[model samples]
Target chain A: AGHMDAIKKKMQMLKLDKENALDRAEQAEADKKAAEERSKQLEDDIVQLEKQLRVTEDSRDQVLEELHKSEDSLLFAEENAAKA
Target chain B: HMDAIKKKMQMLKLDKENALDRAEQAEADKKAAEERSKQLEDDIVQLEKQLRVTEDSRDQVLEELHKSEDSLLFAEENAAKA
Candidate 1:
């Protein structure tokens, strides 16, 4: 009868340890996957913005090209008038 | 016993590492991009301020980055054990 009590106590301790291993490991895995996905979201956003940045930058270049030509034409008008 | 969890840890490590690479690449890309972003924005601002549209209507692609990018913080801060 006394041995039976000892056996119960040992089983209780063993169960706690057994529960901790898989539970903690599993919880850790779940947490990692969730975090990984969140980070993936950030990556996607960043990549998208980077691509858009390229397009936007190209537009700025176009605007500058047009503006520069406009300036050139105005400067040339004065030069042509002065030469004539 | 250890071997059982070892496999899990290894796979987890690989996944985490892959995610980290993506984030790091993003960080680098953001840096390269924003320098150009700022340059383009400045050019647009300068031209507009000088001769283009009025101040109130000076909206270009000059949107401020609402990006939660803090290169100070990263996914590397996360760690897992099995």
Candidate 2:
């Protein structure tokens, strides 16, 4: 009877441990899911920022082109004046 | 010839004015570009930081998952022993 009692106690202890471990596993899975979601969001943000940078660079190039054209026109006028 | 010179001067003045206006526009555009670049750079930095943090968090979570799995394995072993 004492041996049986000891066995019962052991079984109960094992059951409790299993339950605790399973709970921890579930919590870890939840945490992993949340981390994955955050990583995806960060990736999206990086892509959007890169796009904005590209657009800004394009605008800068356009403005530079216009500036060059205006300077060229000015130079042509000055040269014409010198000739006349 | 005098009239021709005067006409040429007038045309030159107009061209100069146009060039100055375009130059001023270019300056404004440059300023805008600078502001945009700065803002975009800042955003990219912030996003990169967030990505790093997220990656770290993912690693930590995976580590915890491994630990949890190990714990469960131990629990199963104990159960089997019993």
Candidate 3:
């Protein structure tokens, strides 16, 4: 009877340990999920920023080209006026 | 009865150890994910700063383009009068 009681007590302690470990694992899983979600959001933000940067660079290039043409026209007109 | 209880105890011990191992592995995974998330956050900050700088440069270029266009128009008008 004494041996049986000891076995039962050990079993109960093991059960408690198992329960605690399972709870810890569950909490860790939840934390992992949250971190992954945040990482996804940050990645998305980076993609959008890169796209914006590309568009802005293209616009700047186009404006620069137009500016070059305008300057050339001004130079030609001034030369013509001087000759006149 | 004692034999049966002893066997059950052994099973419970094995199950508990397995659970402990699972918990350890899960904690490690969570830590790694958090670390990755932190790195991504830093990347986002750097990208955002770069985007702002680019935007400012584009705006400056646009303003200069407008001024150049206006100057060209005035020069052309003077040339026509001449």
Candidate 4:
């Protein structure tokens, strides 16, 4: 009888362990999915930010070009003034 | 009956092993995903910093361009009058 009791106890322990392990696996799977979702969101943000930076850089270049022209005009005016 | 119980215990042991393997694999996958997330977060921080710098540069150039335009207009009017 004692021997049978010991076997039954071992079987119960295994059942509990299996349940715990299954639960742990499910929880880990959920965590991995959440992390992957966050990663995708961050990647999308990077793409948008890169696009914004490029646009800003282009605007800066255009303004710089315009400023160069304005400076050139001022220099020519100054030269004519000096001559006058 | 004792033999049948013993057989059932063996099946339980096998099930537990399978569950343990699944748990271990899931944990490993979770760890890798967490690492990737950290790397992506760092990349986002760097990207945001670059965006800020670019915006500042654009604003500064725009301001300088405005000043240059005003100066050019003043110089042109004076030259025309003279």
Q: Rate the local accuracy (lDDT) of all candidates.
A: 0.50, 0.57, 0.79, 0.81
lDDT of 4 by residue, B1-82 (tens): 8788788878877887887787787778778877887998888898889888888888888898888888888876875797
- For model 3, how does the per-residue alpha-carbon lDDT over B3-26 read when each residue is reduced to its tens digit? 877787788778777777876877
In angstroms, the error of model 2 at B2 is 3.0
Best model per TM-score: 4
User: Candidate 1 lDDT (Cα, whole model)?
Assistant: 0.50
Model 1 lDDT tens row, B10-64: 5655655555555555555555555555555555455544433422222341221
Q: Residue A78 lDDT in model 3?
A: 74
The Cα RMSD of model 4 versus the native structure comes to 2.2
* Candidate 1, superposed: residue stretches over 4 Å from native: A82-84, B1-82
On a 0 to 1 TM-score scale, where does candidate 4 land against the true structure?
Answer: 0.85
DockQ for every model, please: 0.02, 0.02, 0.67, 0.66
Candidate 1, residues A1-84, lDDT tens digits: the string is 686576557546555555555455555555555555555555565565556555655666665555555555555654765788
Residue A34 error for model 4, in Å?
1.6
Better of 1 and 4 by TM-score: 4
Steric clash pairs (candidate 2): none
The C-alpha stretches of model 4 lying farther than 4 A from their native spots are A1-3, A79-84
Better of 1 and 4 by DockQ: 4
Per-residue C-alpha lDDT of model 4 across residues A1-84, encoded as one tens digit per residue? 788688778888978988887787788778877877877888888888889878887887898888888878878877876888
